[PDB]
Each structure stands twice: as structure tokens, then as C-alpha cells.
């Protein structure tokens, strides 16, 4: 699009970035991050799927480790979500720890099967374990 950048709000930064012409996607690599709020969505690599509106209909993330962080309080700066792969509803602000998952905050962490990330006074309570790879 034309220059408008006095009105930006989201920022991604990448060391290797690629469009995906024959399939509409955009794919990013090299310790990449997308920022807007306390949701510290870094990875190595990000696959942004998008439609006719340039609307980013869903995003997939991966790295070594696979995880993102979040800032919840000035002391509770340390919350995070990890899993076998990560997929993100940019359509509603909710991240999903795909297949098998781990979720951590100060004083608590929970792990097991696939789960959607929480930002309220409620947990997932489902329990198990999963290997690294």
C-alpha cells in the first residue's frame, strides 16, 4: 500500500522475510518478533496466512524453544506459552499451544494436551506431560 505510517500500531522485525506468491502467505525467519502490547510474540519463524483483504486470518509460530512470553504485572513480567507447535488467532487475540502444551506464570504452571491461552481469572486444569524434540 501507499505510505500512511503516521498511523502505524503493530510492528514486526525479521532478519529473513519472504512473501509466498504462489500461495498468498508471508513467511518470516531469524529470531523474528511481532509486537503491539504486553503479548511478546517472538519465535525463530512465523508463517502469516492471509486473505483477499490482507487480513491475517491465522498465524503459525516455531523456534528452539517454540515459545512466546507475556508481561502481566511490573513484577509478573515472566508469563509464557510453549508447545509442540504454536498457532495464533490474530482474528481474536488468542494463542493456541498445538498438539501438546505448557503454560507458565509466577507461582503456577500447567502442561499436557493442546490448549488455548488464558488472559482472565480462569485456567485450563487439564494435566499431563509432553517430550521436547
Amino acid at each position: 500500500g501507499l505510505p500512511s505510517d503516521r498511523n502505524q500500531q503493530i510492528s514486526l522485525v525479521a532478519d529473513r522475510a519472504t512473501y509466498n506468491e504462489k500461495t498468498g502467505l508471508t513467511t518470516y525467519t531469524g529470531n523474528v518478533v511481532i509486537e503491539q502490547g504486553t503479548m511478546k510474540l517472538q519465535a525463530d519463524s512465523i508463517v502469516a496466512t492471509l486473505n483477499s483483504k490482507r487480513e491475517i486470518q491465522t498465524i503459525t509460530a516455531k523456534g528452539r524453544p517454540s515459545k512466546f512470553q507475556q508481561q502481566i504485572s511490573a513484577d509478573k513480567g515472566i508469563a509464557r506459552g510453549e508447545g509442540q507447535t504454536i498457532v495464533y488467532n490474530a482474528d481474536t487475540g488468542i494463542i493456541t499451544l498445538s498438539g501438546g502444551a505448557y503454560l507458565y506464570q509466577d507461582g503456577s504452571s500447567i502442561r499436557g494436551n493442546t490448549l488455548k491461552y488464558s488472559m482472565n481469572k480462569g485456567d485450563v486444569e487439564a494435566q499431563g506431560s509432553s517430550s521436547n524434540r
Binding site: P3, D5, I10, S11, V13
Partner: peptide, 16 residues
């Protein structure tokens, strides 16, 4: 609200 696509390797930026 809009997206900034800023580059390492180059110190430049992009949009959609």
C-alpha cells in the same frame, strides 16, 4: 489498525 514490517539485514521497513 496497521502493520509495520521492519527489516534486519537492511535497517529499512515495509507495509502491506
Amino acid at each position: 489498525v496497521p502493520i509495520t514490517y521492519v527489516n534486519r539485514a537492511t535497517x529499512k521497513c515495509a507495509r502491506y
